[PDB]
């Protein structure tokens, strides 16, 4: 009766910035998803392939829990086939994605008076991320023909930017915490199951 550590992911004190999104692997555990699906805490609960209930009756080779913070304005980018700054340069879901995207407003936790500057996102990148790719590059982005040699200036821009969450922002600009559960199924025997 080794239950999986979903509380460590959902009830964590601090969340990762989306460009450096956190991934925790879930293996050799009994998973009770009831705690999450019958929960009034979440504003977003989209499931692909699987159904949100149906869920404690299935098994999987591995479960990946990816956590980060974006603005609610961008939550709809966490979905297959989406485009935009977040989907292109921060966190990309595959087209055959089977899993659930769970999101909730976190203004009590991630907004600070005068701005919270600990949550960043990538604005500049040469090409789109592949599904489940992670880029923690900090190199100055060269927008012009002249190189930048680690110096900022015209046509040389830092590739990351702070969200700057303030509690007075509108709900569209407020911080939302996002957890993406991916259900990996392999040849190998299943290691994560519901109480079923």
């Amino acid at each position, epitope marked *: 009766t080794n239950l999986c550590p979903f509380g460590e992911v959902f009830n964590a004190t601090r969340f990762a910035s989306v460009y450096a999104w956190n991934r925790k692997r879930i293996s050799n555990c009994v998973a009770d998803y009831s705690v999450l699906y019958n929960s009034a805490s979440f504003s977003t609960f989209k499931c692909y392939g699987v159904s949100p209930t149906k869920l404690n009756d299935l098994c999987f080779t591995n479960v990946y829990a990816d956590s980060f913070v974006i603005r609610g304005d961008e939550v709809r980018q966490i979905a297959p086939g989406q*485009t935009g*700054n977040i989907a292109d340069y921060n966190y990309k879901l595959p087209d055959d994605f089977t899993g659930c995207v769970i999101a909730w407003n976190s203004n009590n936790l991630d907004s600070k008076v005068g701005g919270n500057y600990n949550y960043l996102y990538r*604005l*500049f*990148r040469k090409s*789109n991320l592949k599904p489940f790719e992670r880029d923690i590059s900090t190199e100055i982005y060269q927008a*012009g*023909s002249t190189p930048c040699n680690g110096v900022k200036g015209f046509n040389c821009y830092f590739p990351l930017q702070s969200y700057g969450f303030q509690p007075t922002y509108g709900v*569209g600009y407020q911080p939302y915490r996002v957890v993406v559960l991916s259900f990996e199924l392999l040849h190998a025997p299943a290691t994560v199951c519901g109480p079923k």
Partner: antibody
Amino acid sequence: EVQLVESGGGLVQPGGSLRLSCAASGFTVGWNYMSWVRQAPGKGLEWVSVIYPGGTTFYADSVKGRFTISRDNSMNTLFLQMNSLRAEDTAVYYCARVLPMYGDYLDYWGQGTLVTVSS
Amino acid sequence: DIVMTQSPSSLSASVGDRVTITCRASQNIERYLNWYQQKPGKAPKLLIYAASSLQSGVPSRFSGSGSGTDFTLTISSLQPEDFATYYCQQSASSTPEYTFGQGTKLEIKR
């Protein structure tokens, strides 16, 4: 020095097609957010299209399904391919470089090219 | 679609005067508002970004302020070269949904 030069505008019959070009000099178009904005004669500015450095594109509702934005890196040129042109598309078309640092704003504009849709 | 309404539509003032143009957003856009200047037959020029940030190379007599739904562009001492049409532009959504105000035409009185 930085320059954006538009070309390819002219007379096009209703329902026809036309490809506008925007040659850039300072920045390299491949690595930049780029935008097409239009202005009907005597009226205001209307956003048309935008392309991200990764290649993802976005269009205003007035032109989706008819306009497509693209680029040539070796030519350092942005392109706007227009199909099924109507009379309401008659306008000056500007390309502009877009910076995403505080929302999206257009810090460098070309001088535009005129597109007249008439029979 | 966010609607940006500019006021007034037209305005005339004398050289050295202080001029204020207002622009109002249909919804909360925070400080994602830019101001552009367009002189006849020439390329539009960025004056202000981020509501109050003055763009590099733009004379200091141009000032931006506002937040939420109300914004103002101020010219502290009007110059003859400042005759033009001024446009506010919103960029609130993270997905491109840009909208412009209808523009204010500023002519010089002499």
